[PDB]
Structure 1
Amino acid sequence: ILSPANGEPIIVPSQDVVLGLYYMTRDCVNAKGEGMVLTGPKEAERLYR
């Protein structure tokens, strides 16, 4: 998983995987559910789904 030329990883996501992570980790100013306080990631997934 590391490049022999420079030691950097070769398996970095590209294109649509990067787009998906970027879209899901973006923030919106007045998105639905703003200001909620969640017990954890499971509650966040339940609310989103």
Structure 2
Amino acid sequence: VLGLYYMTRDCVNAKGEGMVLTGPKEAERLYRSGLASLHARVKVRITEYE
């Protein structure tokens, strides 16, 4: 629970914020490259099914 909550939390100022990213794959690339902090608020493209 601690990990999930810390993972989903946002911070108003963070490294790499504002950038638009194609998909969660590149989000993984960005964070694992240390180029954007976990709490950065960005705009990303997602897909959902029903």
TM-score normalised per structure 2: 0.61
Larger Cα-atom Rg: 1
More helix by share: 1
Q: Which residue of 2 aligns with 1:26?
A: 9
Aligned residue pairs total 32
Counterpart check, 1:41 vs 2:24: yes
Structure 1 residues without counterparts, runs of 5 or longer: 1-17
* Secondary structure in structure 2 of the residue aligned to 1:23: helix
Query: CA RMSD of the aligned region, Å?
Result: 0.5
The percent of aligned pairs where both chains have the same amino acid is 100
Q: Work out which structure has the larger RCO, using CA pairs closer than 8 Å and 6 or more positions apart in sequence.
A: 2
> Which stretches of structure 1, 4 residues or more, deviate above 4 A after TM superposition?
none
TM-score normalised per structure 1: 0.62
* Secondary structure in structure 1 of the residue aligned to 2:25: helix
